[PDB]
Design a protein around this ligand. Structure first.
Ligand SMILES: [Zn+2]
Ligand SMILES: [Zn+2]
Ligand SMILES: [Zn+2]
Lengths: 190, 82, 7, 97, 572, 90, 228, 96, 7, 96
């Protein structure tokens, strides 16, 4: 085989890629040889013959992303009185997985997304996180933040990583918005 | 404090496109006849299109065509040197 | 100059 | 400067050894990535053995011969270097079919 | 100092140089690499090796999907059309053959041959090859009208609205209403099955069809509907086109308060989505300059045609109709701007260039030559009357006569004898005869212009005012009928003050004419009164120079689309 | 400091990390999950050798003040290397 | 080849003219005038501009001192600021100023105010400052005896940081000046030749780590001297 | 210039003389940049500019152009030469 | 007339 | 010219027979372009041939370097690169 366009079946390669994407988003573990295979496949999918499959790949990666964020948001809902501590660790795992996803979809992010609306794969993860999980529960996740920092002056200090890992979470979910580097974080929390 | 300052015209094109000479040197008119007679008044003149030329050259240019030599726009002076 | 601009 | 490649039957070691450095520095470079002492393994330019104290500059590794565009090739023995799998040939166009 | 060339670019240079051995293997490369290889064929000067590759629809379908690198494609395609390679015609013929072959095949294959048809037709309409995009759109129309299921109805309506655009720009207006009726039937039978379609894109094309037909009263009534049909989910292309045509329709109805509201929002929206070097933004700037030329803000209008031409001249190569229309618009605003100054070397350069482009890419008879050959003739008038030599200006008068007669014949063949454009040509030819010493039919042509304009436009527009002032200067300055020209001068001044404030630029030519009229029949008191008000007009115009350009006028984010559309509809 | 790359033909190419960071996607190859192992199932040995030589050409001639000679991409290895150059973002 | 001689002469005339050393301005004028009638005006077109710039220098400076007195607010530079503008298309002192500079507040007022004067006196002219030819006489009085030394602005930046505080690290010095690192090795080495600053560090080679401090034991035979 | 000299129209003469002025100064700049100030072709353009100045009624600097051309022609090519004779002929025609 | 040919 | 220069830069590190063939092709092609008047596009061919003459210092390469430097001088006088002409001639004397 070579790097030429071929007539590749989208279903089988999508099923092969879904396992790696699942192993990336929750940051469990990925085999490096399998990671190289996923690069070799993410290249071949974007230049598939006769019609490039980059559009289908993007519009199904977003479906996988939205159902993953929906499942994790249900996990947040069922976890009463522990939304913030679990939110910190889940957001850290999801942000590292989003960076590794941007690395995973590098060719699609520089030959089809930049050609067109559509959003970067790494920036689509954070955007979907803030527009599908934060939006239903924006009020609840912030009232505790203000209460904890007010209680620090009142005597009851909060944990460092619990409160500092979310004050920058709103910063990172607007990195793609170069015109608003900090506007969203200031208006909704500060 | 003894200090040294190089003065220059802030045009970045640094070539009078009419006479092809350097924007800081004398124009071709002031280097041909007035080189030995009187060469100190050869200043540059800008325009609305922000294309500075030697004032003698652009006035020499304006005697036949009233457009900027580089881009064919209406030529109107906005800044001189003096 | 006597006339106006052409319509 | 000298840019050359060091191959052991499946590999290729891209170095940046200067004209001042001799064979010993390249042996240390190989040891830094392949973990083999210079006593165990010796390099082979073409079919000729290089003295350790002999500088690569007089061993035919001039700058105009070993530019990074086409670095010089030396064989490594711990030869039988496998060919690079040369790309498919092109039609000669002016060849009469 | 020196940066090494990219391995990708070095391989592109190597693949191009090895072209003969690998000309067909490039067609198997990804569509990303294919555009770069063909752009290197263009850059190296291998236009002959590139024309044979862009004349194949199989190759050109893959290179058309490089949407990021489209501004280069428009400058490569044009480079071939100037080169002498009829790429547009050959692509149209190839698509006609393809559709005639695949008409009876599966509808899924027909759907694929329609999407390729839409992108190719849209490219050839964007590039300015409307006649050559007419064949592609008709060929796609046959494919989508062969079937009758719910899937192809929307494709048929989209092809009809796209096909109406390539007819308005081609000045094939006699087929415009036929295509509108066809799309009317298609969307009427869409409404029968329940599915609804957006009518803003279709109505905005009639907004240009009737505007070019000078049916301003009907064009306004259609642009009301077009702005009513704007929804939230429409693409910025459709919204920008609708706002642009609404502005064009509102200008000629003398509703300049809301025409600015539409055109400034259109300029901002096109600049925000597309960019500052995009052909659609150039179109929006061109019609913004049209607006600013029609509000007596000429100083801010010549700077927008120059901004709209520099986008089209850098994107669409040298000899294109889009560059030609930008020249013929700039040759008219620079005509108007330098009308008092008398510097018509710039305005003639943009007038000889537009004619030199249209006469090369369009047939000897075409309505787009009516506007191009009129403008150059207008500049030829003012150079002649201000020329120091008399034998040269006699020849200039002769050439202007030839141009006016040719433009009038084209306009009459296109529309008839009682059209507003033909009235403008009548007024211009009478204005010519006012300096050609042929006054006896000059007055007849002026009267014809007045009656044709009054029949359609009425007596509430400045278009009739220019002809009234022209006839008044005819009577006053040469024909010696001083008494009957006073009412014409008064009409011109009154209706000029009605619309364009107290500092309308055309009022000077009425004041200095009516003062000359009075200085020969007595009544020195009114001479003194008009000399008093003429200094007031001079200082008013001097204060109203409006040094701020229109790019700073449109600003950034004044309001969204909903506010503009609702304000325009509530104002109506 | 050194990274090794595997061709589709089984060849191994070892180059410094700073040379291999020239490619856009080799940075992503070295990122993500954790001398680093890099495998290409499509890229053969000759084009990867050409890319690896281009790394040393690029880093040595980076921001040089002299006339940089052009990289000799041979006519027969031109399209296979062009595909590799696009995929590697090299 | 008379043209190559001009390149040797123009550079060597530039060094002579701006450092203030000359037998007489009339001799400089006579030399360029005699070369004009021996090789042509275009041969001495740049050289005659070099002499003329020194003639403008007197005319430029007094107008600047007239400008500082005709100020609405009381603005004082605090230093004997001497300036002369040099044509960029004639002088060979351009070279390649790849090293940026940031003068501190001692001379920041002087350099900033001169821009306002020069922008209004002459229209359309921008000033490029050759900071490595500017030599200033700074009040050296941190020790017992007020010695007088001749240092450049490149040398002034190192010295000025030490005048305010006698203990300045080399890490701050290499970042405050915002200029090249290789010339800083020889910048302060010349000061230690005349023992301006003690070698507080122990390493013989001067580097980024070598924090230095001024010399309280410095002695000079002459009150006024030039540091070479 | 020779069309301008041999035509009756004042405006046409002025326009063509200005056009010849532009062409002569551009040619002189090209020759001065390529060869130098002191060369035969630069003197050719100086003599042409002198003739043109004599044609444009600017006799003040036409003389300057003519001696400027002669002092380069007779220096490099010798005091007696064809082009020296042509330039002094132009100078004499300007004088008398 | 009035002069000789241009050099 | 670009194709010839690229191919010469490629086959510079080859045997003397292919270099002889390339120098002959460059001689006929550069002579054609110089005869056609594309001097700026004939220097590149002739500079490539001259570069091919310098890799090996044998007798035939030394002989043909003078030919490349006399044809390179002809495509630099018609192109008015007189400043490079003296350098080319000094190189020609070096090989001669
Ligand atoms: Zn000039
Ligand atoms: Zn001048
Ligand atoms: Zn300009």
């Amino acid at each position: 085989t070579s790097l030429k366009p071929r007539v590749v079946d989208f279903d089988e390669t999508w099923n092969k890629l879904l396992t790696t994407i699942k192993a990336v988003v929750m940051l469990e573990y990925v085999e490096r040889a399998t990671w190289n295979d996923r690069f070799s496949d993410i290249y071949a999918l974007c230049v598939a013959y006769p019609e490039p499959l980059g559009e289908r790949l993007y519009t199904e990666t977003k479906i996988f992303l939205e159902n993953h964020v929906r499942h994790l948001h249900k996990r947040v809902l069922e976890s009463e009185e522990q939304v913030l501590v679990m939110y910190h660790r889940y957001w850290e795992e999801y942000s590292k997985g989003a960076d590794y996803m941007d690395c995973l979809y590098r060719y699609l992010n520089t030959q089809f997304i930049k050609k067109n609306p559509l959003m970067e794969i790494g920036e689509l993860a954070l955007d979907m996180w803030r527009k599908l999980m934060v939006e239903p529960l924006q009020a609840i996740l912030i009232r505790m933040l203000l209460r904890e920092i007010k209680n620090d002056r009142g005597g009851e200090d909060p944990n460092q990583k619990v409160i500092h890992g979310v004050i920058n979470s709103f910063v990172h979910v607007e990195q793609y918005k170069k015109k608003f580097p900090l506007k969203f974080y200031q208006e909704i929390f500060e | 404090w003894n200090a040294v300052a190089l003065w220059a015209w802030d045009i970045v094109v640094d070539n009078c496109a009419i006479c092809r000479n350097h924007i800081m040197d004398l124009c071709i008119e002031c280097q041909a006849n007035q080189a030995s007679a009187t060469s100190e008044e050869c200043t540059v003149a800008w325009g609305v299109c922000n294309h500075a030329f030697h004032f003698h050259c652009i006035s020499r240019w304006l005697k036949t065509r009233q457009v900027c030599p580089l881009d064919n726009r209406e030529w109107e002076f906005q800044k001189y040197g003096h | 100059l006597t006339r106006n601009k052409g319509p | 400067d000298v840019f050359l490649m060091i191959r052991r039957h499946k590999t290729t070691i891209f170095t940046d050894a200067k004209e001042s450095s001799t064979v010993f520095e390249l042996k240390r470079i190989v040891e830094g990535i392949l973990k083999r002492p210079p006593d165990e393994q010796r390099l082979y330019k073409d079919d000729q053995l290089l003295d350790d104290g002999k500088t690569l500059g007089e061993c035919g590794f001039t700058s105009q011969t070993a530019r990074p565009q086409a670095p010089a090739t030396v064989g490594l023995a711990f030869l039988c270097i496998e060919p690079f799998s040369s790309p498919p040939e092109l039609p000669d166009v002016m060849k009469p079919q | 100092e020196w940066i090494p060339e990219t391995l990708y670019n070095t391989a592109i240079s190597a693949v191009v140089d090895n072209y003969i051995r690998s000309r067909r293997d490039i067609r198997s490369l990804p569509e990303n690499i294919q555009f770069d290889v063909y752009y290197k064929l263009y850059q190296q000067g291998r236009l002959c090796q590139l024309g044979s590759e862009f004349c194949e629809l199989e190759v050109f379908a893959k290179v058309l999907r490089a949407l990021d690198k489209r501004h280069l494609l428009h400058h490569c395609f044009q480079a071939l059309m100037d080169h002498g390679v009829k790429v547009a015609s050959v692509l149209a013929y190839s698509f006609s053959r393809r559709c005639s072959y695949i008409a009876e095949s599966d509808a899924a294959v027909k759907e694929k041959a329609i999407q390729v048809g839409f992108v190719l037709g849209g490219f050839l309409s964007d590039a300015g090859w409307y006649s050559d995009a007419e064949k592609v759109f008709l060929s796609c129309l046959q494919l989508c009208t062969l079937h009758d299921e719910m899937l192809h109805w929307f494709r048929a309506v989209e092809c009809c609205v796209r096909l109406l655009h390539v007819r308005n720009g081609n000045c094939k207006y006699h087929l415009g209403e036929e295509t509108f009726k066809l799309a009317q039937t298609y969307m009427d039978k869409l409404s029968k099955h329940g599915q609804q379609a957006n009518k803003a894109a279709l109505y905005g094309e009639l907004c240009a069809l009737l505007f070019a037909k000078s049916h301003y009263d009907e064009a306004y009534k259609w642009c009301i509907e077009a702005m009513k049909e704007i929804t939230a989910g429409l693409p910025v292309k459709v919204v920008v086109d609708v706002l642009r045509q609404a502005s064009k329709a509102c200008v000629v109805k003398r509703e300049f308060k809301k025409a600015e509201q539409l055109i400034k929002h259109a300029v901002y929206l096109a600049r925000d989505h597309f960019g500052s070097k995009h052909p659609k933004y150039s179109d929006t700037l061109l019609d913004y300059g049209f607006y600013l030329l029609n509000v007596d803000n000429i100083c801010q209008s010549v700077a927008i045609y120059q901004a709209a031409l520099d986008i089209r001249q850098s994107v669409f190569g040298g000899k294109n109709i889009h560059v030609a229309t930008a020249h013929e618009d700039l040759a008219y605003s620079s005509y108007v701007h330098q009308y008092s100054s008398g510097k018509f070397d710039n305005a003639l350069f943009h007038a000889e260039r537009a004619i030199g482009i249209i006469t090369h890419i369009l047939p000897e008879d075409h309505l787009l030559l009516a506007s191009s050959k009129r403008v150059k003739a207008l500049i030829l008038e003012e150079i002649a009357i201000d020329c120091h030599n008399k034998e040269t200006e006699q020849r200039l008068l002769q050439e202007a006569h030839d141009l006016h007669l040719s433009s009038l014949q084209l306009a009459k063949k296109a529309f008839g004898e009682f059209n507003v454009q033909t009235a403008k040509h009548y007024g211009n030819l009478g204005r010519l005869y006012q300096s050609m010493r042929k006054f006896k039919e000059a007055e007849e042509m002026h009267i014809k212009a007045i009656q044709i304009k009054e029949q359609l436009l009425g007596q509430e527009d400045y278009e009739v005012a220019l002809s009234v002032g022209h006839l008044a200067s005819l009577y006053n300055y040469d024909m010696n009928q001083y008494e009957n020209a006073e009412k014409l001068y008064l009409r011109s001044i009154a209706i000029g003050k009605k619309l364009f404030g107290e500092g309308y630029s055309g009022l000077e030519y009425d004041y200095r004419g009516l003062i000359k009229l009075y200085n020969s029949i007595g009544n020195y008191e009114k001479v003194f009164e008009y000399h008093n008000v003429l200094s007031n007009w001079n200082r008013l115009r001097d204060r109203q120079y409006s040094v701020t350009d229109a790019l700073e006028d449109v600003s950034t984010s004044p309001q969204s689309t909903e506010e503009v559309v609702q304000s325009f509809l509530i104002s109506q | 400091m050194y990274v090794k790359l595997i061709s589709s033909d089984g060849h191994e190419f070892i180059v410094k990390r700073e040379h291999a960071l020239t490619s856009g996607t080799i940075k992503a190859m070295l990122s993500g999950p954790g001398t680093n192992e890099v495998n290409f199932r499509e890229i053969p040995s000759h084009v990867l050798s050409k890319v690896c030589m281009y790394f040393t050409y690029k880093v040595r001639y980076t921001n040089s003040s002299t006339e940089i000679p052009e990289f000799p991409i041979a006519p027969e290895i031109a399209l296979e290397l062009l595909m590799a150059a696009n995929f590697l973002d090299c | 080849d008379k043209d190559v001689f001009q390149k040797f002469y123009a550079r060597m005339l530039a060094k002579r003219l701006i450092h203030g050393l000359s037998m007489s301005m009339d001799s400089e004028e006579a030399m360029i005038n005699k070369l004009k009638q021996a090789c042509g005006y275009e041969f001495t077109s740049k050289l005659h501009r070099m002499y003329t710039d020194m003639s403008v220098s007197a005319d430029l400076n007094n107008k600047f001192n007239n400008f500082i007195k005709n100020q609405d607010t009381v603005i004082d530079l605090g230093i004997s600021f001497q300036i002369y503008v040099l044509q960029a298309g004639a002088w060979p002192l351009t070279q390649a100023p790849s090293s940026t500079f940031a003068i501190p507040q001692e001379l920041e007022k002087s350099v900033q105010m001169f821009e306002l004067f020069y922008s209004q006196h002459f229209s359309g002219r921008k000033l490029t400052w050759l900071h490595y030819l500017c030599t200033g006489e700074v009040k050296m009085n941190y020790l017992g005896k007020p010695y007088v030394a001749m240092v450049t602005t490149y040398q002034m930046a190192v010295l000025l940081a030490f005048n305010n505080s006698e203990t300045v690290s080399y890490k701050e010095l290499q970042d405050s000046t915002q200029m090249n690192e290789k010339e800083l090795t020889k910048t302060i080495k010349s000061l230690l030749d005349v023992k301006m600053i003690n070698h507080d560090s122990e390493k013989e080679d001067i580097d980024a780590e070598s924090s230095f401090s001024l010399n309280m034991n410095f002695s000079s035979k002459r009150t006024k001297f030039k540091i070479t």
